Nucleic acid binder design. Sequence first.
DNA 1: ACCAGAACGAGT
DNA 2: ACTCGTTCTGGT
DNA 3: AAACACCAGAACGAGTAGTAAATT
DNA 4: TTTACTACTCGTTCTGGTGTTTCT
Lengths: 287, 282, 287, 282, 107, 107
Amino acid sequence: GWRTVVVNIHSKLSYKNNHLIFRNSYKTEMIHLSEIDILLLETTDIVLTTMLVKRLVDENILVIFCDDKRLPTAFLTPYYARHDSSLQIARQIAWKENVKCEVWTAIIAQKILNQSYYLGECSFFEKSQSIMELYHGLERFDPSNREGHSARIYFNTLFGNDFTRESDNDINAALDYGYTLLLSMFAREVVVCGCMTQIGLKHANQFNQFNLASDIMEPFRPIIDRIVYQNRHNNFVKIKKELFSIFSETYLYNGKEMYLSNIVSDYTKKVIKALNQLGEEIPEFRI
Amino acid sequence: GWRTVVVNIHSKLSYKNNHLIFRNSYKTEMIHLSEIDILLLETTDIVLTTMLVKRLVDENILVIFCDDKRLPTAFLTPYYARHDSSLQIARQIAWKENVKCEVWTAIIAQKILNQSYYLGECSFFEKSQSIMELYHGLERFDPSNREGHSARIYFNTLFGNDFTRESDNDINAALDYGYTLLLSMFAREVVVCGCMTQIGLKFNQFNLASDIMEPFRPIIDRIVYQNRHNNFVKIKKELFSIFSETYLYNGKEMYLSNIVSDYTKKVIKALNQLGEEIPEFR
Amino acid sequence: GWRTVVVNIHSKLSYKNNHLIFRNSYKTEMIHLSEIDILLLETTDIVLTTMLVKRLVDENILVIFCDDKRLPTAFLTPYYARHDSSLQIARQIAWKENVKCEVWTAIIAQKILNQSYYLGECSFFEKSQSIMELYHGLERFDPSNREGHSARIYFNTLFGNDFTRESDNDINAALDYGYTLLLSMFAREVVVCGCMTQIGLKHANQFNQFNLASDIMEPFRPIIDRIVYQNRHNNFVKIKKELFSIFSETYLYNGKEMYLSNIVSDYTKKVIKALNQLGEEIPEFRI
Amino acid sequence: GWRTVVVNIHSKLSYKNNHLIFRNSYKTEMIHLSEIDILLLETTDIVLTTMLVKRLVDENILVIFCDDKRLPTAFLTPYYARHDSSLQIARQIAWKENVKCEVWTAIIAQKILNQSYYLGECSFFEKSQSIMELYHGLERFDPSNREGHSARIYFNTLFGNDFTRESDNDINAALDYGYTLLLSMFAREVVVCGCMTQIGLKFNQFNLASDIMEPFRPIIDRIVYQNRHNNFVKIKKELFSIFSETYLYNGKEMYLSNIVSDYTKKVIKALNQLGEEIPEFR
Amino acid sequence: YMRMILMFDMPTDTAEERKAYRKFRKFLLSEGFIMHQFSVYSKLLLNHTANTAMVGRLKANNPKKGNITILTVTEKQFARMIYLYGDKNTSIANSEERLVFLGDNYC
Amino acid sequence: YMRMILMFDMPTDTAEERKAYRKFRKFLLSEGFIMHQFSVYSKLLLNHTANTAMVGRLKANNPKKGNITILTVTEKQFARMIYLYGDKNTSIANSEERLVFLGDNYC
DNA sequence: ACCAGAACGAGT
DNA sequence: ACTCGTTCTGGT
DNA sequence: AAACACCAGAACGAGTAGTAAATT
DNA sequence: TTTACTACTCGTTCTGGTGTTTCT
Ligand SMILES: [Mg+2]
Ligand SMILES: [Mg+2]
């Protein structure tokens, strides 16, 4: 099939007449299990019958579950027949280091470009020039933490002399939560794409379970810093509502305005194709 | 966990205060989530919430979903079950053939060795002698499929010589019911131990568990044996007893869940680095 | 000493300055422990100090206790020195059968004459003559139960065709309780006199713990029958108040009117003296 | 009963709901009347009601009243303690000398025999030999007061040769404290067993108990022994331990209350009719 | 020596429902049941025959109401009883003592 | 397998006195304590190390109020427990069963 | 985790 | 009432 | 769907007051 | 000086209801 159903509201999913019933307050929608490639449950509120699960495996659909933090936790695994997304895990292991190095260089280049461009939009001309000077020519597989210096410059221009994790103000009371609010998107997309977040490109650190999720969210990070910077002086309890504009607001991708959910889905798919050495252009997110 | 939960009737399974709540029109029950080990949802009438599924996968309960014939068809594998998960996967890539060959030859030795004891209990001394020709005359990487030949000899001693494991009988269906329950057990233990069930020590989603389980395969060919005559419901009911009965492992009598958990953790110890011994079950 | 003290009401007995203090609602009386021969506690309401008990044995006084039914239950026994009433028990054992036979013959004689005289006062002339003829000459140590026939005649004239214990009317709801209300008097007096109620004169039955009490009370039973006969038609609840006239009303003894408590005390003392072969006339109770 | 109650302070002892209630301005306490065995009112400040005394004598607690020096001076004797009391009294009159002589010679044999073991514990082998000359050379009705001579020999081994039991000091005061406690025990047991304490098997109010107690007299001369040095309060406190400690009787270890009740019940069996054996305590 | 705990739950909605709770509590206190806690009462029985006799007596004096439950524990467990907050009952009736001094122990 | 009983009385007179009774009861039910009776709660602990661990957890989560008392009984005594009037709890959580059928036992 | 000792309960 | 067997706890 | 918060209700539970009775 | 009522009184106690909130 083609449709990937994302159940993110209090619902009741059941099965009658080869049709996924997705009942809620708004619309007791009708969806055909023939079309459903991947059912993705995005909340803990949803109620699903065992009969539906029986006929979600019969049609070979990936039933992914999510916990309270909207993060992937378990995918329903069939004994007999398996989805078409169960072969990427066996090729993700055999991913060559060269494609990982190139795609990481591109992702980090996009991160520095986004931070420098937003600094240009943050009324810091010399700081924007310095941020681009950190990556005037993107250091090909930089061994040292030059990205550390670039982040230092960007966060110094953004949030003041220090924007590290130590300070307890909305500098981290918002950036921490937002940076976990988008980690859920990339983790969920990576597991949807049939990939394993646990092992990712340039993820030499084994301390992070969400390796590929963070590594591919690196380009999409500056949205959170932008929304925080605009509403920085406000309290954190206000930022809990301010940061939610990500889903409502549409950003430019592929030349057109799209919701960030569609953008992260497309970006994750294109990066996954790139690491498969399909030859596709590593996707770009910049404004 | 220690309890084994089998839900066969129409109900709604929900969460409340670290408890699984079972609500049939007749009864309401609460079972503490730490007590449950297996949740075997045989019937297609269970209406379980997704909030229950989250707490179930954090507590690592082996939730198994069946089909209309009450035959297992799916189960839940947690994406993130161990803190060291990424390390174990990265090391799993670095699983050279030299350790894999030794681990598989050890495990196949254990499988044929445990096959011999059932023939001893089946009053087949000459069939046990053929199994011993395959066992002492062990094979490395099975050049002649001596494991398959020993399995065929054990079956010929076990079932009629004409009977084949692939053919469809009541015995040949329960012998796979039990195999699917045990496969779920070992898949859960592998994924909890940080490894990947989809890799294989000698692809397919359960290749790792399908080998580590092999020494425990005769546990299923004996329960089916002692009750081979009666109908499928009876062999299914006695197959359920693996969760309840007790089996001897190491130097103590432990329930099969603990034997599965301990065995599935020693093999990973040796595969990770050649500094462990593959344990023997009998 | 000479005074015997009968503490019958809710009291508090204590000891200060060689004086038994007997406090109650009426009079916090003063009694000297030198004069006290026998202290007799008659109820369960009394409060006594241990200091008083210490100075009750020091002066060698018999401290007799009583239970809820006003019946003797325990006498305070001193280790070192003993009362003058502790020698009768060891001579009661050596009482000869001849004195017991004579005293029982006179005791049952008084019982039969009392019943016959009351029948003469009960408007039964022929029955009075028949009761007298049952003992026209008192059968000297009668072997058979001729006293049973005398009681049959008396009770037939008194309470109708049958006055046995079976009937549940006031014939037994009053006579039984009243016959236990005077058993208390004789038991308490016999134990006060330093005698043992357990073994009694002509008391062949071993089922009777109050042997001598009953044996000496036999002449005093008829008062209860008179009192119930006067108030026979009334209910037993009324007889519980009517029977209490025993203590208030004074009867003729020794030629003068006395309370029945004094009468039973003197009668018990004289019967005990007669059983001792002192030669005293066995006392008489008849009206 | 099993508890032993010793009231040494100012209080008021009362009755409520089958309980003894102890009320000092500091404390209020309730003890179930079936649990109590001895109520030892040492102090002259106890203010006890008479309703308590009734329930105490129906439940047969050994209530003992002492004097200013906390030395026993009186105790309660129940008039009616046995349903069969009158028959035991009437039979007690029919106590011929032929059975009394045998029972007394048995009891005096037990007393001297138990005296010998203490000499064995007192490291006096020659004094034990003199006691054995009195014991094996036993006397019937004590023609030569051989019981008194054996007691004198045991004392000379026990106390200094100049010391006499009648003389006054700490030892010969506690030796009578314990004797009065034991005498109260045996008087209670005789009066409960339906007999008369004032009669004697060989008058005085405790003649029956003063002979039945005799085999248990060395129970008191050993506690006084082991603590003879210290002041009277110490020997009194260790004398209190007869209620608490355990002594071997028949074939089992029982507390001295059970030995006293048990011993005082077969002696009456033999005196009543010559169809019982006088039990031996050691 | 073993302890018995008699946890009870008994309804109080009618006169006969409360006229048998009062009788039950009077019987409980009469036979020597120390109030461990509200509706949790305990008795120290010296031997097993005492336990059998009092089980028979309780069965004979059943209020026939509510939920009355008997647990019999060895004195080891009643002495290993753990009090998170609170204090043990220090009364004489709660101890297996045989020598008991309602007064001054001579020590 | 041994049972644990946690009898408690806890005061209810102030807000803080009732704000810790509710927390204590939530903890009790959260850790799997079956309400035997009002204020008498029981848990089936499979081994002794579980008893030690949960004693430590209870000590760490003490309301620090009232009278909370722990008795640990062997399952023999919790099964010999006598009900004068009433019925045993027949729930699955109250049994030492290892094979449990929320449905039809195939027998 | 296993073994030994002690205590408790049941049966003869 | 005594003795033996079973189980529970403590220690290495 | 579930956790957290307190508020309110109906039931469980012991103690204290008061009256009555107190020799089958 | 106890026991035998029922009465009432204040404390223990569990459940139900309504609101609020939710990826640090
Ligand atoms: Mg209760
Ligand atoms: Mg409570």
